[PDB]
Ligand binder design. Sequence first.
Ligand code: OGA
Ligand code: MG
Ligand code: NI
Ligand code: ZN
Length: 331
Amino acid sequence: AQNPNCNIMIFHPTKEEFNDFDKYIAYMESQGAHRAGLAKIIPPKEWKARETYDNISEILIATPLQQVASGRAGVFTQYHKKKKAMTVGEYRHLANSKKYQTPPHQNFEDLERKYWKNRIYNSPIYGADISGSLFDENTKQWNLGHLGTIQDLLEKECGVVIEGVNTPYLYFGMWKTTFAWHTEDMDLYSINYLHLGEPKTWYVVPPEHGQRLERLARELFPGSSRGCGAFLRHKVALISPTVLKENGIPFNRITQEAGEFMVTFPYGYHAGFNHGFNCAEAINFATPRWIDYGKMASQCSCGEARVTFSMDAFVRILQPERYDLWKRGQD
Ligand SMILES: O=C(O)CNC(=O)C(=O)O
Ligand SMILES: [Mg+2]
Ligand code: NI
Ligand SMILES: [Zn+2]
């Protein structure tokens, strides 16, 4: 069995190997990459996502989210308070202000220590989940707006034709902005490209051990667990590496830098934080190997997780018993 310790693998495709996205994903899995839950892909040196970022300040962040924490430094939840709209130029200036900017630090490790010590005492503002793309239309390789759609994958594998669309999302981050522990909707893959700015640190639990993280989360967030049988779908809970290590939960960590892709694999729980002002683009995708994960994915029916239009069909076709109850949650 390849990668039996479930280490995060790093790939360096050549420009030739960068042509066929599906084939490269399947290659990485042949090497055991999925066992980690997360892989890094460094593009060939010849590739570029677009020519310059010199003209992005006019993108609007219609609903910036202030991420307010509750709990203790290593075990906390965050709620998202909606803020007034601002442009990316306005948000970048805010990120760089004395109140929000990255503190002085020695290296990524020192910064990680400072994040876990101090995150809860601040409320950074995240421009998350903005429909759009920063890939040039002329970028033909690994262009996250030109991927094969999940609807088409389901049609190709299973013969069924369904409504829905699959588009990318932009994320504008600042120091301490946080993504809580989650898997993707319907335990899909994700791919994330860091277009510019400061790094993003990721934590990940191997898919084969995801249920160990779930059991810990039920113990650490006991009221949330009674409220919902899949409350990590709410995307609000944080657990630090120190707490994971104290509880024996297998995990890995890695830092993504500008110019690099990350892939998350079906049922790979992940969480993380941004080092400073940055912009990422991400989208969900599927392969044939996902279908069985999609059939088994948990679902939030308490009503909190409230998701996209396109998830309806995935539930309807892959999980027809749950359909009914899950849709009561969404309506
Ligand atoms: O970048 C972020 O804030 C969160 N991204 C993801 O969870 C992802 O790409 O799957
Ligand atoms: Mg602009
Ligand atoms: Ni994710
Ligand atoms: Zn729920």
